[PDB]
Design a protein around this ligand. Structure first.
Ligand SMILES: [Sr+2]
Ligand SMILES: [Sr+2]
Length: 95
RNA sequence: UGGCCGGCAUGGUCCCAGCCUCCUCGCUGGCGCCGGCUGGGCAACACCAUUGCACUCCGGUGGUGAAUGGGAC
């Protein structure tokens, strides 16, 4: 079952050999044009590696980012993008 | 040598260059042969496993089973 629109996009299929700090930097480099980004969360743990959460301030940004960068070759791999199942805390602490 | 021991070999002190390494990366570390014991840590690196929905840092295993020469006294 797909997912409903969200402030946060969930990206996976990312190159696992990239360190956390660099991955966050590179992700911002390509995703900041879609709108203000509140934060990017990345973890290299067994369960969370290869994935990232880009948290946009406005849902239109996420939606854009989602449609525009679906399948984008990043670090030699096609980026897969979806909306996050639930709202990230940063967003809850507001709306 | 990450810590520890044994056997054998080996004149010494330096100077220059090169080379080596998971555990004080370098000029007041190290760079003969052989065998056995043991500690730490995944931080870097590699390999294996993982396609995974978080907002709690947190998979496993491996490496030293390493590295040459010149010169001055
Ligand atoms: Sr050493
Ligand atoms: Sr590890």
């Amino acid at each position: 079952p797909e997912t409903r629109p969200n402030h946060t996009i969930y990206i996976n299929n990312l190159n696992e050999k990239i360190k956390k700090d660099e991955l966050k930097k590179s992700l911002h480099a390509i995703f900041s044009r879609f709108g203000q980004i509140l934060d990017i969360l990345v973890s290299r743990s067994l369960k969370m590696r290869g994935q990232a959460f880009v948290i946009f301030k406005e849902v239109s940004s996420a939606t854009n980012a989602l449609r525009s960068m679906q399948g984008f070759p990043f670090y030699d791999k096609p980026m897969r993008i979806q909306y996050a199942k639930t709202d990230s805390d940063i967003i809850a602490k507001m709306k």
